[PDB]
Design a protein around this ligand. Structure first.
Ligand SMILES: Nc1ncnc2c1ncn2[C@@H]1O[C@H](COP(=O)(O)OP(=O)(O)OP(=O)(O)O)[C@@H](O)[C@H]1O
Lengths: 993, 372, 97
């Protein structure tokens, strides 16, 4: 048969190209050339062709030769998988410690040696942090397990795989070296977040959601459990971080590996097409696509025998970057997979020309093409015009294997459903809708009677004996004991909070159905749950979140118990907000989700049920004064001073029958204060207890995903080091405490403001635009200033009122302040304090620096030589300009400098010339102020109108003057700028248009 | 019922917010349309007595009755389907990809002559169509006017509007403080003046025209009483450097639309008859005596000579006036005004306290400002 | 206020300004008219005049634009200057009339 001949030819090609370097005993092929080193990702991608060939051969059964060939191919694939698994197992100690305090020195080495499976390089001579390789290995292991191949052989391997899944689940808030093992464009021993990493990690987590590693013969003890919260967080991260490559790269050719056949970890097909269009526009060439802009790999310069290149790539590698046919193979696979035929033909025709022959006329895929050193200027002057030459590893196993797989799929010998048994091709299918179920219970009989009197039918905590209700802390503690082994020294999953998407699904433990309340209604953890408005708003937000994704199969269920702390003052009826929320839920609509009210037994018939198989079997004078003192605030102050002096954990000996420590008395005081609902000492109590807001790291990474900078506390020069990369929970808490210092409550206020900002980022991601850095301390000072202005009180009274403000009032006040809604002097102070600048301010500043020698801000200088080193779209230039403009500590002066820069930009646009000198914007604003004073004196204003700033030398009327108008500040600024330009011109004007 | 609305309309991302209502997009599953659903709470989270609830229900029923009364007009908004539940109200409208007139106005500062002409024509058509059915809105504001992909404006917020009979006059006062006729202040003084009339929409249209053309409301001040007295006295003035380069026809049309006396205010039909809104395609009855031909030839020669002098009358760059006064150059003034608006473009929302005229300070900040 | 006779005269002038009826005076037709009259304006001058007369950069002048331009007030000195220039152009021959 012709098909048999074609299959035999493909098998011969595979044997002569990839299988020739099988490296028996271990089964890990060398990464081509004279390297003698094995890469996990390279081997995994190379074995894809062998796996596809074996799958194709398996179909033509009923013959001894075909069966033997298929068995040999599957055995080779299994041997490679077992070798890789053993290599990972050899670093169990590293895998276990990475889990706590995620660092670059705690991860397993990405470079694995040849036979004898040892380490080839040290822990500091290479970048041993690549979550993409682990994610792709786990994903393909799951795919082959679902196909039918047997790889896992013992329960210890299952535990190790679970530990690896736990280790990779934290990919959405950590920085790695990426696919290229070089971090950003400049190595400099730095790493940054990559979209490919988190995408492949999410895809691997999705693939291993409930996979059975032992196949059809496996039992309940050999199933991998993966949380859904991490997957949704990674999805949201990718959605909010995929208009470009990363924080530093504007585009990367590796983005295809996220939006194509490998791992299919993307939705919103419009975004996929958009990203593919930009990739084609910015990277496509005559011999493939470039990896990314401004890369110096395999270049005729930059001293190839060097690393950590200095920041001098202004024009050296621009327009002469190498191109890789691997991205063309990616495009071929993407076209041949979903629905495309003509694109496949055109890309195959393009790729056939760039192919170079080998021994016995064998096709070979070169690693990359490089521009000859002689024809360097021609390429820069005429892009994509010169002819490159082959270089790198000529037998590129990755590219050749991918091309072979694509050709086999195009020829029709293989189907898209064979390599993807998990049906990941339909990941872009829109989700029609989802219905969420909410169950309401009464803690006591009185609550149930009250609800019945108000037309609400519910069931108490009792009479539901088959079902049990416990807080999410118990669920977290239970999940912490999964994947625990003593022989291999595995500590299991580290303790972490459980989101709404986790507690919603039902759990079956010991043949009993267990339901858990949402984690956000725990008043013990924090005082946020005390406020009813926060309760209803956060419930609506959680409901919206649940209705949005719900990537898990089955219908959900939310349990909302009614506590005794939400009752009215008389304690006889429910509050208005809770009653309104319950009535809205009864009508089948609340927030942005459709709800139906019913019984837990009714919801039990169809719901998301998960089975946990692993759960199967003078001091005395001070104490007397504290006991006898009134004025509970003074009581809290006394408790604090004894806590700081001699009460860390020592017993106060207040009682005689029972010895109660300071912590017990503190908890009793907190409970007593919670009943009276008085927010005067709650902040002090929380600060003393060192209570931290849950999921603070989640809020931090959500804020940082949009290229934002966070600065805590009041700004002095030395302290308040900026935050640019995600940090663990312990490091974040330590930094917050260090910034807060001895004020204690400052940390609590900072945490509250940070969580409010993170919450408002998701709901309204247009309010926080145009702002590059967020300063919590500056925000606190601004809020205190507005409170003092509104109440016409002192700073101490304003701070006391701010402390006494309810959390809902705090959120409303922060919303109002951020909105900039409620004279001109106060408005300018608010604008300067929050450093609000136009969107195109960066481009205008960059153009001005291009057209001018520099800018003077009365101190230091900003040279124009930085425009070639930087780009307008790069964050480093933006933070440099902000730091240059942040020297002046007056927000009004900052706004004046900003508008002076804007008018100078307008003048430079109008006037075509080169300034060729340093312009002082401080001198410009001084000249404008002098002109305004002269005009006021001429008009007739007296001495009281021509006021003088105590420490800035600027008239108050100038601040109060409106920006636009016949006598606006912009006219004076334009006059002063033109006067300065004339003063720095050769006795003439050079402005025409 | 609510089940039918849920099965037929799918809630989506929020598209707008109100005082007590939220507007979101919806999809009609049988049709796969892209309509919009407006949801307004009844109890408002239990923040008021049931009397407010029944008052709100009466307001919504009046609004839906009025919207059904004027249904079928393509230029007027259309209410396809309405739903009512115990604690939730669902109304279906036509979703529009473009924002309100306020956003476009603050983005473009000042619109072109054709744009303002077509907007004025559409709004005048709205008012005459409404008056033919004896309906007054009394809330003609740019915030209540939106735009679509075809740059066609459609009036919304019919809740304030109520149907009226001949011979009755309204007494309630509502709306933005800078949109009141002298009838309102006369009636609200103690009891003297009878009530509302029909020229409130006339002055509202005049205010819309002035705000859109000049870029700022005709009347604005930092004090409530000061600007109230100013608008009551009708002492509005045209800006010198802004209205100088404008035609006289729009000026006198606006002046007629801002007449303090309700009797002398131009009606809608007279406004349509104005030479601003008339257009001609072709005519063949333009025949007269040779004197008419001679007059036409003389006028043509005069127009040709006038157009022969335009290019020689243009001013050069003239950096001297630029340094002495940057407002002399109209393009430069427009550029600096646009830059100033873009600098503070996030502070133009609903509210009389902050508006477009706040950013402009034509008055000199001198000792004379103290006198009042 | 305008008049019906003035409107008819303006319409006739607009129709006669362009050789072909398309609603626009057109730069080419204006240049041909100028050359026929006996004037040779520069291309840059014509472009500047078109830009100044027009309210935007669309590069086309319409009948309402011409009507608005003709509605401008020249005061007193500009009027006598214009009529003197028109008489001088018309009085090409050395006759004084
Ligand atoms: N089809 C629509 N497309 C876009 N926005 C719409 C649409 N229909 C209504 N809106 C929005 O809903 C609101 C309609 O006004 P609404 O009466 O709800 O608000 P308000 O606060 O009471 O005051 P106002 O009517 O003066 O804006 C506006 O914010 C408007 O932008």
């Amino acid at each position: 048969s012709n098909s048999g001949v074609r299959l035999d030819g493909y098998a011969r090609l595979v044997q002569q190209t990839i299988l020739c370097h099988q490296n028996p005993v271990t089964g890990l092929l060398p990464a081509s050339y004279d390297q003698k080193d094995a890469w996990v990702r390279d081997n995994v991608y190379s074995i894809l062709a062998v796996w596809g060939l074996g799958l194709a051969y398996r179909k033509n059964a009923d013959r001894d030769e075909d069966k033997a060939k298929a068995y040999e191919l599957e055995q080779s694939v299994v041997k490679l998988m077992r070798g890789l698994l053993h290599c990972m197992i050899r670093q169990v100690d590293k895998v276990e410690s990475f889990k706590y305090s995620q660092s670059t020195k705690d991860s397993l080495h990405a470079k694995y040696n040849t036979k004898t499976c040892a380490t080839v390089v040290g822990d500091d001579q290479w970048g041993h942090l690549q979550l993409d390789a682990t994610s792709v290995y786990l994903l393909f292991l799951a795919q082959m397990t679902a196909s039918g191949l047997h790889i896992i052989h013992s329960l210890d391997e299952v535990n190790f795989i679970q530990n690896l899944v736990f280790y990779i689940e934290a990919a959405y808030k950590t920085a790695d070296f990426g696919i290229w093992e070089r971090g950003d464009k400049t190595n400099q021993g730095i790493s940054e977040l990559n979209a490919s990493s988190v995408g492949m990690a999410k895809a691997a987590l999705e693939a291993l959601d409930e996979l059975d590693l032992f196949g059809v013969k496996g039992g309940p003890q050999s199933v991998i459990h993966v949380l859904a919260d991490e997957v949704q967080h990674c999805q949201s991260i990718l959605n909010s971080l995929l208009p470009r490559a990363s924080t530093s790269k504007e585009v990367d050719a590796s983005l295809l590996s996220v939006v194509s056949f490998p791992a299919f970890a993307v939705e919103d097909s419009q975004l996929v097409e958009l990203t593919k269009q930009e990739i084609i526009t910015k990277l496509q060439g005559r011999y493939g696509c470039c990896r990314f802009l401004r890369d110096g790999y395999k270049t005729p310069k930059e001293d190839p025998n060097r690393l950590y290149y200095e920041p001098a790539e202004l024009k050296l590698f621009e327009n002469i970057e190498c191109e890789w046919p691997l991205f063309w193979t990616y495009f071929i696979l993407d076209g041949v997979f979903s629905g495309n035929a003509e694109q496949v033909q055109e890309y195959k025709e393009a790729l056939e020309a760039v192919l170079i022959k080998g021994k016995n006329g064998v096709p070979l895929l070169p690693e990359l093409y490089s521009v000859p050193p002689d024809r360097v200027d021609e390429e820069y002057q005429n892009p994509h015009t010169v002819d490159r030459v082959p270089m790198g590893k000529l037998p590129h196993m990755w590219g050749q294997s991918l091309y072979i797989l694509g050709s086999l799929m195009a020829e029709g010998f293989l189907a898209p459903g064979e390599i993807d048994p998990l049906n990941r091709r339909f990941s872009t299918v829109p989700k029609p809708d989802v219905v969420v179920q909410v169950s309401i219970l009464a803690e006591t009989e009185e609550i149930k009677t009250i609800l019945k009197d108000k037309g609400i039918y519910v069931e108490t905590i009792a009479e539901v004996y088959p079902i049990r209700v416990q807080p999410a802390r118990i669920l977290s503690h239970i999940y912490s004991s999964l994947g625990c082994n003593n022989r291999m020294k595995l500590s299991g999953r580290p303790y972490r909070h459980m989101g709404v998407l986790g507690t919603s699904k039902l759990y079956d433990i010991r043949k009993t159905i267990f339901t858990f309340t949402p984690q956000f209604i725990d008043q013990q953890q924090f005082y946020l749950a005390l406020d009813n408005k926060m309760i209803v708003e956060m419930l609506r937000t959680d409901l919206s979140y649940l209705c949005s994704r719900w990537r898990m199969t089955g219908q959900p269920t939310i349990t909302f118990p009614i506590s005794h702390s939400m009752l009215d003052e008389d304690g006889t009826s429910l509050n208005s907000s809770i009653l309104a929320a319950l009535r809205k839920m009864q009508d089948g609509y609340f927030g942005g989700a459709r709800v139906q009210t019913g019984k837990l037994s009714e919801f039990l018939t169809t719901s998301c049920c998960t089975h946990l198989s692993f759960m199967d079997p003078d001091f005395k004078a001070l104490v007397l004064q504290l006991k006898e003192t009134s004025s509970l605030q003074e009581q809290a102050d006394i408790l604090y001073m004894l806590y700081t002096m001699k009460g860390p954990d020592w017993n106060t000996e207040l009682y005689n029958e029972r010895s109660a420590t300071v912590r017990e008395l503190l908890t009793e005081l907190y409970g007593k204060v919670g009943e009276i609902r008085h927010w005067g000492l709650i902040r002090y109590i929380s600060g003393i207890l060192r209570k931290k807001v849950e999921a603070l790291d989640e809020a931090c990474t959500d804020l940082l995903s949009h290229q934002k900078h966070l600065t805590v506390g009041l700004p002095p020069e030395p302290r308040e080091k900026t935050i640019s990369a995600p940090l663990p929970y312990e490091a974040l808490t330590q930094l917050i405490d260090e910034a807060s210092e001895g004020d204690m409550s400052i940390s609590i206020l900072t945490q509250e403001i940070m969580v409010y900002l993170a919450m408002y980022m998701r709901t309204q991601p247009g309010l926080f635009a145009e702002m590059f850095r967020l300063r919590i301390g500056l925000i606190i000072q601004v809020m205190a200033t507005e409170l003092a202005h509104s109440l016409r009180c002192s700073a101490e009274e304003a701070t006391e009122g701010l402390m006494n403000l309810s959390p809902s009032a705090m959120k409303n006040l922060l919303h109002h302040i951020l909105s900039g809604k409620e004279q001109w002097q106060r408005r300018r102070r608010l604008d300067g304090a929050l450093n609000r600048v136009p969107v195109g301010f960066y481009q205008k500043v960059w153009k001005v620096l291009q057209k001018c020698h520099g800018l003077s801000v009365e101190g230091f200088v900003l040279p124009s030589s930085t425009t070639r080193e930087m780009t307008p779209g790069e964050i480093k230039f933006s933070v440099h300009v902000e730091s240059v403009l942040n020297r002046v500590p007056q927000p009004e002066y900052r706004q004046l400098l900003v508008e002076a820069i804007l008018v100078l930009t307008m003048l430079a646009d109008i006037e075509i010339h080169s300034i060729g000198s340093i312009i002082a914007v401080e001198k410009i604003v001084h000249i404008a102020n002098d002109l305004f004073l002269q005009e006021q004196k001429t008009l007739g204003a007296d001495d009281t109108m021509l006021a003088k700033d105590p420490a800035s030398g600027i008239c108050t009327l100038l601040y109060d003057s409106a920006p636009s108008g016949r006598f606006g500040t912009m006219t004076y600024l334009s006059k002063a700028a033109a006067t300065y330009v004339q003063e720095f011109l050769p006795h003439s004007i050079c402005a025409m248009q | 019922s609510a089940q039918d609305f849920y099965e037929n309309y799918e809630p989506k991302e929020i598209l707008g917010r109100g005082v007590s209502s939220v507007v979101r997009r919806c999809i009609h599953k049988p049709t796969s349309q892209e309509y919009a659903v407006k949801v307004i709470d009844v109890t408002g989270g239990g923040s008021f007595s049931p009397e407010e609830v029944r008052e709100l229900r009466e307001a919504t029923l009046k609004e839906v009755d009025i919207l059904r009364k004027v249904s079928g007009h393509p230029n007027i908004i259309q209410l396809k389907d309405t739903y009512e539940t115990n604690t939730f109200f669902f109304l279906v409208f036509d979703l529009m990809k473009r924002g309100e007139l306020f956003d476009y106005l603050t983005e473009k500062v000042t619109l072109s002559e054709k744009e303002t002409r077509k907007i004025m024509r559409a709004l005048l058509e709205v008012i005459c169509t409404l008056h033919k059915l004896n309906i007054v809105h009394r809330d003609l504001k740019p915030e209540n006017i939106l735009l679509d992909d075809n740059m066609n404006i459609k009036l919304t917020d019919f809740g304030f509007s109520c149907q009226l009979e001949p011979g009755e006059r309204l007494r309630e006062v509502c709306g933005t403080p800078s949109y009141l006729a002298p009838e309102i202040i006369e009636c609200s003084m103690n009891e003297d003046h009878p009530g509302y009339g029909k020229e409130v929409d006339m002055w509202s249209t005049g205010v819309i025209m002035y705000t859109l053309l000049a870029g700022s409301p005709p009347f604005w001040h930092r004090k409530q009483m000061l600007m109230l007295r100013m608008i009551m006295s009708g002492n509005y003035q045209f800006g010198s450097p802004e209205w100088d380069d404008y035609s006289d026809t729009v000026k006198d049309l606006v002046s007629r639309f801002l007449v303090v006396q309700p009797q002398n205010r131009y009606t809608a039909e007279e406004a349509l008859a104005h030479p601003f809104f008339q257009q001609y395609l072709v005519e063949e009855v333009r025949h007269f005596s040779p004197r008419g031909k001679f007059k036409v030839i003389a006028l043509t020669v005069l127009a040709s000579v006038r157009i022969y002098y335009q290019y020689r009358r243009v001013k050069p760059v003239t950096r001297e006036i630029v340094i002495r006064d940057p407002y002399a150059l109209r393009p430069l003034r427009r550029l600096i005004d646009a830059y100033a608006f873009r600098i503070y473009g996030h502070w133009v929302k609903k509210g009389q306290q902050q508006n477009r005229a706040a950013l402009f300070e034509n008055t000199p900040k001198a000792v004379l400002l103290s006198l009042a | 206020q305008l008049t019906e006779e003035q409107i008819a005269e303006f319409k006739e002038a607009f129709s006669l300004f362009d050789k072909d009826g398309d609603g626009t005076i057109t730069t080419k037709e204006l240049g041909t008219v100028m050359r026929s009259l006996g004037q040779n304006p520069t291309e840059a001058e014509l472009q500047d005049m078109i830009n100044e007369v027009d309210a935007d950069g669309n590069g086309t002048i319409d009948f309402p634009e011409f009507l608005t331009m003709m509605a401008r007030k020249m005061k007193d000195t500009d009027s006598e200057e214009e009529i003197r220039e028109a008489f001088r152009v018309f009085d090409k021959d050395g006759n004084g009339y």
